From a paper:
We found that adjuvanted protein or mRNA-LNP immunization of rhesus macaques with ApexGT6, an Env trimer engineered to bind Apex bnAb precursors, consistently induced Apex bnAb-related precursors with long HCDR3s bearing bnAb-like sequence motifs. Cryo-electron microscopy revealed that elicited Apex bnAb-related HCDR3s possessed structures combining elements of several prototype Apex bnAbs. The primary hurdle to eliciting Apex bnAbs is believed to be the low frequency of bnAb-precursor B cells possessing a long (≥ 24 amino acid [aa]) and acidic HCDR3 that can penetrate the glycan shield and bind to the positively charged surface within the Apex epitopic region. We designed a slightly improved germline-targeting trimer, ApexGT6, with affinity for additional PCT64- and PG9-class precursors, and we evaluated B cell responses to this trimer delivered as an adjuvanted soluble protein or mRNA-encoded membrane-anchored protein in RMs.
Numbering used by the authors:
A (entry chain L): 1 to 27, 27A, 27B, 27C, 27D, 28 to 213
B (entry chain H): 2 to 82, 82A, 82B, 82C, 83 to 100, 100A, 100B, 100C, ...
Write the structure that this text describes.
């Protein structure tokens, strides 16, 4: 089967600045008179869509700041001016021989100015406590860059191993991330302790921010 | 032009599952049709294709186990999957390939342009191959606290993926973040969906999270209120 390889696998770029992605086939994609090499864009939470076909033809709706070039076995996707809405994963695909095969994907990340998170803490709902479980949620909202640290403290005891984090894909308009950390406790343990706190460390914060609440207040 | 996949859900290893794809706003019988799959977080792998004359093609990873078929009368493509393995767990997309037709004196033809491209893709159907059973979620409110306020819903303890969440039946989309699900140590998934809104709206604007977990037939609308 044809092996497709793409580079770089991550591409950070500032809106307004150009970008390019290289693809390389293990065999020639020329049919002595078309070359069957395509580019697909997968935006966050969407399926792939065709961006360029046959090396250099733009699919419907694709503006001319995108172009493709190459020949035989080496190909390049170029964007002359990136926009924040370009965030996604770009894939090369050969169609000269079944099975069609894809390169690994290049994740375009949009660079922007540092943005500190807004932090919010949520106690377990009375509804959940009635069910017999307790989840505390800490939300870090609309921040950049992605690296953030969340620590949980329960009556000043550091929690280790009983929380899980989930992070959004970069937003297509403001190029930020959001993050949730969920601390899981049994109802008995939640009801034994008083102060619940999430401490956030981020490049945009001059010192760590703590949001906390007292069970019952 | 639209492709809408159906059939996705949970199946145990060794069993079989049939996906369908309904085509609309295009002459279905005049296109080749393909299936491509993607394990969440990973790249793309071509699964199968059927020409407008019903010839079928397969890579070796599924050859012998999957069968593609079409019923032009119904504007539908099918992928019958047998002897499933955990590693076939993936989102399966149907996609339209080369365009052509049939003329009835001269036979099948293809347009030269776009012949080996996939120009229309469906939204995908997640197939999960697992010996765990279906479990519907609990939906709990994340109440806004006592500038900008945050609220949400916690969709806890469900299997398999996926769950969808909208706010106010789709009317509320700005400021909404629905997080990727996390697999808890129990083997069930959980996710949170949050929205940031003006604090001044909390007394008067109604916020409702609409949760849908199709594998368990669980649909819930949960009003989230300040306490």
């Amino acid at each position: 089967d044809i092996v497709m390889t793409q580079t770089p696998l991550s591409l950070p770029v500032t809106p307004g600045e150009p970008a390019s992605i290289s693809c390389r086939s293990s065999q020639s994609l020329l049919d002595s008179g078309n070359t069957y090499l395509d580019w697909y864009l997968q935006r966050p939470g969407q399926s792939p869509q065709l961006l360029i076909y046959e090396v250099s033809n733009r699919a419907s709706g694709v503006p001319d700041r995108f172009s493709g070039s190459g020949s035989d076995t080496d190909f390049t996707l170029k964007v002359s001016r990136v926009e924040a809405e370009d965030v996604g994963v770009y894939y090369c695909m050969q169609g000269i021989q079944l099975p069609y095969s894809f390169g690994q994907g290049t994740k375009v990340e949009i660079k922007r100015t540092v943005a500190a998170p807004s932090v919010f803490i949520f106690p377990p709902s009375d509804e959940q406590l009635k069910s017999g479980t307790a989840s505390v949620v800490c939300l870090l909202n609309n921040f950049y860059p992605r690296e953030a640290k969340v620590q949980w403290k329960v009556d000043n005891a550091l929690q280790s191993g009983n929380s899980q984090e989930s992070v959004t894909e970069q937003d297509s308009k403001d190029s930020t991330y959001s993050l949730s950390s969920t601390l899981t406790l049994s109802k008995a343990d939640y009801e034994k302790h008083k102060v619940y706190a999430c401490e956030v460390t981020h490049q945009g914060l001059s010192s760590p921010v703590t949001k906390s609440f007292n069970r019952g207040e | 032009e639209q492709l809408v996949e159906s059939g996705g859900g949970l199946v145990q290893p060794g069993a079989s599952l049939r996906l369908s794809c309904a085509a609309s706003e295009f002459t279905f019988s005049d296109s080749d049709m393909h299936w491509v799959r993607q394990v969440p977080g990973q790249g793309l792998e071509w699964v199968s294709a059927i020409s407008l004359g019903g010839d079928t093609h397969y890579p070796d990873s599924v050859k012998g186990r999957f069968t593609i078929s079409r019923d032009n009368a119904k504007n539908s493509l099918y992928l019958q999957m047998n002897s499933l393995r955990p590693e076939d767990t993936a989102v399966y997309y149907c996609a339209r390939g080369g365009r052509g037709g049939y003329e009835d004196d001269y036979g099948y033809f293809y347009f030269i342009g776009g012949r080996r491209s996939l120009d229309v893709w469906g939204r995908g159907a997640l197939v999960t191959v697992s010996s765990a059973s279906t479990k519907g979620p609990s939906v709990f409110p994340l109440a806004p606290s006592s500038g900008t306020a945050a609220l949400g819903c916690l969709v806890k303890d469900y299997f398999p993926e996926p769950v969808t969440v909208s706010w106010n039946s789709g009317a509320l989309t700005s400021g909404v973040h629905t997080f990727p699900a996390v697999l808890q140590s129990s083997g069930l998934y959980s996710l949170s969906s949050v929205v940031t809104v003006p604090s001044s709206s909390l007394g008067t604007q109604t916020y409702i999270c609409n949760v849908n977990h199709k594998p368990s037939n669980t649909k819930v609308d949960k009003k989230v209120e300040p306490k």
